[PDB]
């Protein structure tokens, strides 16, 4: 290669530690300006080949060995709360120890036995990539189970899992609060109700992606029209507002 084979800008620039809000803003602005200038230059130089090239920037040294993520220390990175409405992609598991997660587990739970039993044999944390593409380690799902009998409450069980669900197969009742694109229903004859069928086929905006194992209208179904009658009687009430 040539003499400037390592982007000699590294040897001429020293990104010192930040300071108060104004200094943080100035350092971030200058680093962003330099990065944007380099991106603009290399975009003008090549074009689409540069735009879609793989990009991978991590705070520390990160190795992907098969399905496992190896890193020395997970120091550096903002904290956040994972939303149930956000879509994540499973990327793997890591055995890196995060001090904040362990301290939070110690603090939130009054049961120290679970705490140091998990400490001695730690579960791997799960790495997920958001829609934008930000890798994040997520804390393990830890649940308490306190049983109340008559007037006695006993902290009985403590469960430890990962709290992640796949949108590939679900029950009909669970799907009543969701919107899907392609649906393949599997009814069970004998206990079929028209309400369940209505909920199941109401999940798709179009009928081009709907499938079932039986015709719910040609079988024996349970009909309970007590609410539909009231709603229809409400549509004939002059005092009820109707919005199109």
């Amino acid at each position: 290669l040539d003499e400037q084979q390592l982007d000699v800008f590294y040897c001429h620039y020293t990104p010192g530690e930040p300071e108060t809000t104004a200094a943080v803003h100035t350092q971030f602005a200058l680093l962003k300006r330099a990065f944007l200038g380099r991106f603009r230059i290399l975009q003008e130089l090549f074009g689409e080949a540069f735009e879609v090239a793989p990009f991978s920037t991590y705070v520390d040294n990160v190795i992907f060995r098969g399905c496992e993520m190896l890193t020395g220390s997970p120091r550096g990175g903002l904290m956040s709360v994972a939303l149930q409405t956000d879509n994540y992609t499973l990327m793997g598991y890591t055995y890196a120890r995060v001090f904040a997660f362990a301290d939070e587990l110690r603090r939130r739970h009054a049961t120290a036995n679970v705490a140091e039993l998990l400490e001695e044999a730690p579960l791997p944390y799960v790495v997920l990539r958001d829609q934008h593409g930000f890798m994040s380690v997520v804390n393990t799902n830890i649940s308490e189970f306190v049983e109340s009998i008559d007037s006695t409450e006993l902290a009985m069980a403590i469960n430890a899992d990962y709290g992640i669900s796949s949108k590939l197969a679900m029950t009909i009742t669970r799907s009543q609060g969701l919107s899907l694109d392609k649906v393949a229903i599997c009814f069970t004859p004998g206990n079929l109700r028209l309400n369940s069928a209505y909920v199941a086929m109401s999940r798709t905006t179009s009928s081009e992606f709907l499938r079932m194992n039986l015709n719910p209208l040609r079988e024996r179904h349970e009909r309970d029209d007590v609410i539909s009658e009231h709603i229809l009687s409400a549509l004939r009430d002059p005092n009820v507002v109707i919005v199109y």
Binding site: Q4, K32, P74, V81, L168, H230, A234, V243
Partner: protein, 550 residues
């Protein structure tokens, strides 16, 4: 376009706003406002048999309509115009409503109604309904229904009242609002000129002391006994602090949004002597209001009902007609039966993971979902299409021996195998209902001594590079990577990423992206080392980069 899609949904909401404004300003009489002595007497009880016949005034407004028909715009207008408290039945609904409101103009963080009226962690595992109650008056009055709903919810209601009256520091009445009122009386100022600034100075006050209009989204996914408890809690929360709305004799107005047809609630009970769980269907709040005669006459539901029709999602003729037939309970003809025949497909076709790749399968049981997931994982392992490798992870439950000893002493049960109890109670230890759909292997049990614990360990099978959802809070930490340069520049140019975080982490968040920008260099030559790019263009890039650096 976008202008005529809101014409009919922006001129038809003004009557709703006027009616809610008129409902939310009505003043009660001095003899109907619940006093603090009511809740003090309630907290000093042992069984819900001494509860007297008292009425808690309230008003409702119904906003019902199909999914996607545009009730969210009505809630947006209500939030922008009125001074209301927007809540949600679940966390998903609350997050969706917060996203919509914050994307429209502006919104505070949105919490569930259970967090609003003080539902704590222990109240999750209460035995809902153990003291029998029989209606006395025929037809039933409002007081009888309220007493029945309080008797059903006795454990949670009693715990809430006890905690609320005990967190007052003894007989010392809460002085968050009383001192301001005393200063108003002493200084000779207008009423409410100083007390209404209390929410500004104190940040721990509940939202029920701020407004009397409570918007409940997805009200169909709630038990009917939550129609009274909320109201009860409201009065309690407004009786302790002597809120200015309580001094003005104002009633709570519950605006319920939801679809009464394709949404229902369930009630579960556990028989310990049989180690059994029984689940049945019950009435939600919407059905409670619409069907009950007493509530219909009391709340004047004819003048407080807004039905949203027309669907922005359905775009097919026959499918729309079938949906209308199913929703309103119209008679089913033979043409509908002939139409639905298009989608029939053999069961083995659906259950086989090979056919219909990437489709979501709805079953009627958890065992079927688990079996299909196991079959899909086995098929993916052998007939691999690539880019997804199936792996397994450990999961474990800890059981305390002393608590189990107390449980067995209380509940007779001379023998109780760990495996049998954990199998029977597998639907309650977890905190989310999808734990029964997970592919799990052989369940192992061991006894860990010097901790006096029992460890139940198992393995759960996951697929790499799959789209999944996190059904919990599960605080996370980001540590880099952006996929492609275009996405990196998109996230760098926009500051919305900083705004998505709370307004306390901005400084070190900016620090984090600064160090990400620093560490994002190098390896550009690997991109330059792509096969057969150029020779002189590399030197031109060298010169341009050096000039920019200089």
């Amino acid at each position: 376009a976008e202008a005529f899609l809101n014409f009919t949904s922006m001129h038809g909401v003004q009557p709703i706003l006027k009616r809610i404004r008129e409902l939310s300003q009505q003043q009660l009489d001095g003899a109907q406002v619940p006093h603090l002595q009511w809740f003090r007497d309630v907290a000093a009880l042992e069984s819900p048999a001494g509860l007297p016949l008292r009425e808690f005034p309230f008003a409702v407004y119904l906003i019902t309509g199909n999914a996607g028909s545009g009730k969210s715009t009505c809630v947006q207008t209500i939030n922008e115009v009125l001074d209301c408290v927007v809540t949600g039945a679940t966390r998903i609904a609350a997050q969706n409503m917060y996203a919509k409101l914050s994307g429209a103009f502006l919104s505070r963080p949105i919490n569930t109604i259970f967090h609003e009226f003080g539902f704590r962690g222990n109240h999750v595992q209460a035995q809902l309904g153990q003291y029998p109650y029989t209606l006395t008056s025929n037809p039933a009055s409002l007081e009888d229904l309220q007493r029945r709903d309080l008797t059903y919810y006795w454990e949670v209601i009693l715990d809430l009242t006890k905690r609320a009256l005990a967190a007052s520091g003894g007989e010392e009445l809460r002085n968050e609002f009383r001192a301001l009122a005393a200063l108003e009386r002493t200084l000779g100022l207008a009423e409410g000129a100083l007390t209404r600034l209390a929410p500004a100075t104190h940040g721990a006050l509940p939202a029920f002391t701020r407004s009397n209009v409570i918007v409940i989204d997805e009200a169909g996914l709630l038990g009917r006994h939550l129609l009274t408890a909320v109201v009860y809690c409201w009065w309690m929360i407004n009786a302790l602090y002597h809120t200015p709305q309580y001094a003005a004799r104002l009633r709570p107005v519950l605006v319920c949004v939801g679809s009464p047809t394709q949404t229902a609630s369930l009630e579960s009970t556990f028989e310990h002597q049989k180690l059994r769980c029984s689940v049945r269907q019950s009435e939600n709040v919407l059905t409670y209001l619409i069907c009950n005669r007493t509530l219909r006459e009391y709340a004047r539901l004819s003048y407080s009902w807004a039905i949203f029709i027309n669907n922005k999602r359905c775009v097919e003729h026959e499918f729309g007609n079938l949906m209308k037939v199913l929703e309103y309970g119209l008679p089913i003809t033979e043409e509908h039966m002939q139409f639905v025949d298009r989608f029939v497909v053999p069961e083995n076709y659906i259950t086989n993971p090979a056919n219909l790749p990437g489709w979501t399968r709805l079953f009627s049981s958890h065992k079927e979902v688990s079996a299909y997931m196991a079959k899909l994982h086995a098929y993916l392992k052998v007939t691999r299409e690539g880019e997804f490798v199936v792996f397994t992870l450990p999961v474990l439950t800890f059981v305390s021996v002393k608590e189990f000893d107390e449980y067995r002493r209380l509940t007779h049960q001379p023998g109780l195998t760990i495996e049998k109890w954990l199998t029977a109670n597998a639907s309650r230890i977890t905190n989310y209902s999808q734990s029964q759909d997970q592919d799990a292997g052989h369940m192992r049990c061991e006894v860990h001594s010097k901790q006096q614990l029992v460890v139940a360990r198992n393995d759960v099978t996951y697929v790499l590079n799959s789209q999944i959802a996190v059904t919990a809070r599960l605080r996370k930490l980001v540590f880099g990577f952006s996929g492609t340069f275009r996405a990196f520049e998109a996230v760098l140019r926009d500051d919305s990423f900083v705004k998505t975080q709370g307004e306390t982490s901005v400084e070190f968040a900016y620090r984090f992206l600064s160090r990400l920008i620093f560490s994002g260099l190098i390896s550009f030559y690997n991109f330059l080392q792509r096969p057969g790019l150029d020779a002189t263009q590399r030197t031109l890039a060298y010169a341009r980069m050096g000039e920019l650096t200089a």
